[PDB]
Amino acid sequence: GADNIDVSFQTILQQERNWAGLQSKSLKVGDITWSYSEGGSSTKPTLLLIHGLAGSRDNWNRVAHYLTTNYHVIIPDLPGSGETIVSQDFDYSVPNLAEKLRRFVEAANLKGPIHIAGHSLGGSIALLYAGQYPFETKSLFLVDSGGIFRSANTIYLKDPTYLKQLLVSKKGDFNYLLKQTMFNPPFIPKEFLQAQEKLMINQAPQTQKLVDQLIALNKVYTPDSFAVLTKTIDAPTLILWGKQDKIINVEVANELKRLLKNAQPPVILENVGHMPILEAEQLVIQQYVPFLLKVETNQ
């Protein structure tokens, strides 16, 4: 008819980043070409936002929109995601992702203690970063974070081989993934869903490598190992969960609270799944902005 919309999905992503007050940047650090979003004034406190498995920097756009006015926001595409380029034989283990993220923070010249937020696998990376670089970590915000828990009660945590069922490798897989990761998914036009699914299918060989590394990491380390790591983290911490999270059960939020010395009581969002940053961004910001103000005042 007379009202056809003809647009590239990449142009849509560009417009959403602009709406969030972000611009796309690139930085070569060793053998990695990092793709990242950056917003806000360099005079403002630095915030590093870390996405999860098979995600991308754009997962944080809805939340970042509320932070780029008063904060200096940095959102990288991790190896295996978005436009970040790595070697064909890259090491996708969580320890290597945390160490290479530190090299990126250094090369991006983001000095002093920085506020760090992590979603899902991003939360696991944020925890390792906070433990290895405590004087470089101003605060921690864990959104349905991974880890190795005694209170684990999902098939994905009990046997990470089940993470292979969440891989997007063929048409229709993205709809299956959304049904497992979200309880209140946002509005996603069918045409946008299909475009996003295709990008994930293109990254599938890398996601498979990440998953295999995660399976091997879970065989090596235990909840005892995780307790040793969390014992070393003194950073003030905010924990937020979706009550309906099918990937990492909500009981784990209380375990993280018990394990982290300076963690606040967890925020549990009713009718929200594993991705509050896309399912309830205004409710996430309602908690995170007063937390950041409190940490800034106490410093």
Let me know the angle formed at the C-alpha of 217 by 215 and 218, rounded to the nearest 5 degrees. 65
Report resolution (Å) to 1 decimal.
1.7
What strands lie across the sheet with 22-29, from one edge to the other? 22-29, 32-39, 72-76, 46-50, 114-119, 137-143, 237-242, 267-269
Q: What are phi and psi of 153, to 5 degrees?
A: -145, 35
Q: How far is CA 100 from CA 26, 30, 41, 76, in A?
A: 15, 9, 25, 11
Look-up: residue for tokens 């091997």? 216
Which of 296, 282, 247 lies closest to 65, judged by CA? 282
Structural domain range at position 42: 1-299
Cα separation, 182 vs 276, whole angstroms: 8
Experimental method: X-ray
Cα separation, 92 vs 35, whole angstroms: 16
Structurally, the chain folds into a number of domains equal to 1
For residue 22, the domain's CATH number is 3.40.50.1820
